[PDB]
Amino acid sequence: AEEFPVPNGFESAYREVDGVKLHYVKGGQGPLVMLVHGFGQTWYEWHQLMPELAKRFTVIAPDLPGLGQSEPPKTGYSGEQVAVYLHKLARQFSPDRPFDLVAHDIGIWNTYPMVVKNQADIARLVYMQAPIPDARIYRFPAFTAQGESLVWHFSFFAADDRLAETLIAGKERFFLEHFIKSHASNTEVFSERLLDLYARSYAKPHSLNASFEYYRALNESVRQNAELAKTRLQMPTMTLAGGGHGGMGTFQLEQMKAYAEDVEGHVLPGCGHWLPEECAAPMNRLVIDFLSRGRH
Amino acid sequence: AEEFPVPNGFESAYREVDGVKLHYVKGGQGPLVMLVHGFGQTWYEWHQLMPELAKRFTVIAPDLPGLGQSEPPKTGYSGEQVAVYLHKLARQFSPDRPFDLVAHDIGIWNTYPMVVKNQADIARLVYMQAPIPDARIYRFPAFTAQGESLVWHFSFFAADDRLAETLIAGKERFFLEHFIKSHASNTEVFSERLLDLYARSYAKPHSLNASFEYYRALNESVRQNAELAKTRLQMPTMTLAGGGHGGMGTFQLEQMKAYAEDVEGHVLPGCGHWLPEECAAPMNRLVIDFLSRGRHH
């Protein structure tokens, strides 16, 4: 059974990593690029970028532990714990060569520790639309002169008593449409058909719970990254952010400059949080061009 | 059927104000003190203070429009619109002398405009445990290094799509217990009986909606107050805030200093947000003493 349609020529498969069965979709030939999705979504957010990249790269897009068709992690949900699974998975397919990494939203949280701890394994890096967990996240506002803020959901999802799961259970389709569209500029791309696909996946009880456990571990990830960030990233990096409603704007690049020696950033106008869907043509172009500076 | 038990010597009653039927509980004799409750609660949060205060004052505790047993407003939920109802209600009972005002949480939002526009009508003012709506509210953090922050609910409640009503319906008791305890230092004061009473009240569909419409009007109230605040408050003012988990700390007095010429403040250690319940005895004493410096009975 497949929660989302696999693009022609790709395979849907599983790989046991440290006792956790991870789902992924893989296609193409050449050096490896791993694409890591974020909250509210699965590997499928990459499905329009994957065929283009696969003309030059071996592309793998896993489901984060507990989300999509991947089993929950056995260690924990902090960035350092989850990054182990993702690093080992990539190195199964690229054991003797560095690979490229693209990550969106909490895909950043779940990959930054393995990037900084294994810099020689990462050829090039693309991060989009979320802060790396650090003290800057405590400076975002709870409420803005326009209304709900970009990251008030951090508190909602991290609250104890299983607050978010208890309220959202049975209402997952309603909640996800509101969450996605409230963070979008080009809302029209989120058809009811596409929203049904994403909602059915994260409504699995273990996936709804896994979604919020990433936020329950966020302060631990901040504490982890305070130590790890004493070492700057040395490989070529690109950041992307939306310039429209729901976008991180200039924050994405400005934070990354504290982390990376070699970084270029782009703000995409008229685009919010969901870059692969809201602004597929310019985002795909930027990613393909940046990764194609390396060998393929 | 009363939603909450009425203290001995008090009456539960209704008055029509601008076509809206407002519920209140009233007792005592002497100059008028109006006590205005906040989110998650009703007039009943004042039920321990009211009999003490009624020894020297006429005490009235209304339900905010749409909450408790009061009809929703027919104008809107911004501070300036709601304050009209509360001002006119007070004037029905104290038309010839200024009255005192005590407000908690969004009771502040719903009274500040009528205080600033009708200062001759306000003898003394007590505000506790919420910012006056102004630009300062945009500085509170979305998330903290210890977990959820004090006012992320501003965004949750103001969200469109009836986000809050839709997620909380069928879970009203669960949500209110979490909200109260996450903003409290002393949770033991909230018995199962008391939580049941508050949950049943705000679970009424029009009251659940009304609860969040106050927040959907919050930016409008901020914009209204930006004009109103050009006139400082001149009456004696006291602020109270909790010093414990859920409390506003020094923020309450420090904000009020920008609004009021004559202001004193107290921070109560070991108390969170729900001062009339968490720290009833010292809160009651401070209010009674502050109001009894003025003329009473």
Side-chain angles (χ1 to χ4, degrees), chain B residues 77-154:
Chain B
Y77 289 88
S78 72
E80 249 187 305
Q81 296 169 301
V82 176
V84 171
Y85 295 109
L86 297 179
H87 182 242
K88 289 189 171 195
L89 180 67
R91 289 306 282 183
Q92 286 186 24
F93 296 99
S94 183
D96 307 336
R97 43 209 303 172
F99 60 92
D100 293 331
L101 179 75
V102 185
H104 182 197
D105 188 75
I106 65 169
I108 295 165
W109 305 359
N110 290 315
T111 56
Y112 168 71
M114 70 104 169
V115 171
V116 70
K117 292 189 297 180
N118 304 282
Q119 297 205 28
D121 298 346
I122 303 300
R124 293 176 175 265
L125 177 66
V126 181
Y127 270 178
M128 62 187 76
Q129 274 300 131
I132 298 172
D134 67 21
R136 296 170 171 80
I137 71 173
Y138 307 136
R139 308 208 61 76
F140 284 92
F143 190 62
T144 80
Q146 284 83 32
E148 63 171 291
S149 69
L150 270 175
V151 303
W152 68 266
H153 67 275
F154 287 4

Side-chain angles (χ1 to χ4, degrees), chain A residues 137-149 151-152 154-156 158-163 166-169 171 174-175 177-178 215 218-219 223, chain B residues 137-149 151-152 154-156 158-163 166-169 171 174-175 178 215 218-219 222-223:
Chain A
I137 70 171
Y138 308 132
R139 302 303 282 99
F140 283 87
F143 186 72
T144 69
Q146 328 302 324
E148 67 163 282
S149 61
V151 297
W152 69 264
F154 285 4
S155 277
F156 185 27
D160 59 24
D161 293 335
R162 284 156 68 94
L163 177 70
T166 306
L167 297 193
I168 290 168
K171 309 164 200 116
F174 164 79
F175 176 75
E177 175 166 1
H178 173 86
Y215 298 83
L218 181 55
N219 282 324
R223 299 192 293 271
Chain B
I137 71 173
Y138 307 136
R139 308 208 61 76
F140 284 92
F143 190 62
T144 80
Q146 284 83 32
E148 63 171 291
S149 69
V151 303
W152 68 266
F154 287 4
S155 282
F156 182 31
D160 72 340
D161 291 332
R162 289 169 62 95
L163 177 68
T166 303
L167 298 188
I168 289 168
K171 299 287 192 308
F174 169 80
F175 176 78
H178 178 93
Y215 295 82
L218 177 54
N219 278 327
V222 167
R223 293 187 297 266

